[PDB]
Design a protein around this ligand. Structure first.
Ligand SMILES: C[C@@H]1C[C@H]2[C@@H]3CCC4=CC(=O)C=C[C@]4(C)[C@@]3(F)[C@@H](O)C[C@]2(C)[C@@]1(O)C(=O)COP(=O)(O)O
Length: 144
């Protein structure tokens, strides 16, 4: 399949699914651009390189607590209960929250590598799983 995909077996149901080890995306169905546009939702934690945001002057949550928050947001976005944009605007620990998480367009070479690799491995309209950087934990949405 496309870059980074492996076949796996559901631990609960036993049904085949597909997992991407670059984006941390997972899906039931069987699955590089010079520039991409992405949005993100960042949840910071106490070990983030800058443990502060517009939401909270001192970010004290643990990495484990941050991951739980990220996992919950992913659930709500995938279920359609919430839009990615809505959750980014409300809960992202990044100044880009004011722009619905939009970071604009970019080529490779500009940023932290796990974020870059995930961004360039996503298809248009596809969303990542939890992506870990020195900043915290990200959900990334490729928009263009
Ligand atoms: C890992 C994220 C993603 C970064 C952005 C990727 C795209 C980009 C390309 C550029 O050419 C210039 C800027 C951006 C838009 C980008 F690099 C930056 O905004 C920084 C981003 C969000 C980031 O590193 C961050 O979350 C820093 O947060 P803290 O510093 O608080 O730890």
């Amino acid at each position: 399949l496309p870059p980074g995909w492996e076949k796996a077996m559901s631990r609960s149901s036993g049904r085949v699914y597909y997992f991407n080890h670059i984006t941390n995306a997972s899906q039931w169905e069987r699955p590089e651009p010079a520039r991409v546009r992405c949005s993100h939702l960042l949840v910071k934690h106490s070990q983030s390189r800058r443990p502060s945001s517009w939401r909270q002057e001192k970010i004290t949550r643990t990495k484990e607590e941050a991951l739980e928050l990220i996992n919950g947001y992913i659930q709500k976005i995938k279920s359609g209960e919430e839009d990615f944009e809505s959750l980014a605007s409300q809960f992202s620990d990044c100044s880009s929250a004011k722009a619905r998480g939009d970071l604009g367009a970019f080529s490779r070479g500009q940023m932290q590598k796990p974020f870059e690799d995930a961004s360039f491995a996503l298809r248009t309209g596809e969303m990542s799983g939890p992506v870990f950087t020195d900043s915290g934990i990200h959900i990334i949405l490729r928009t263009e």
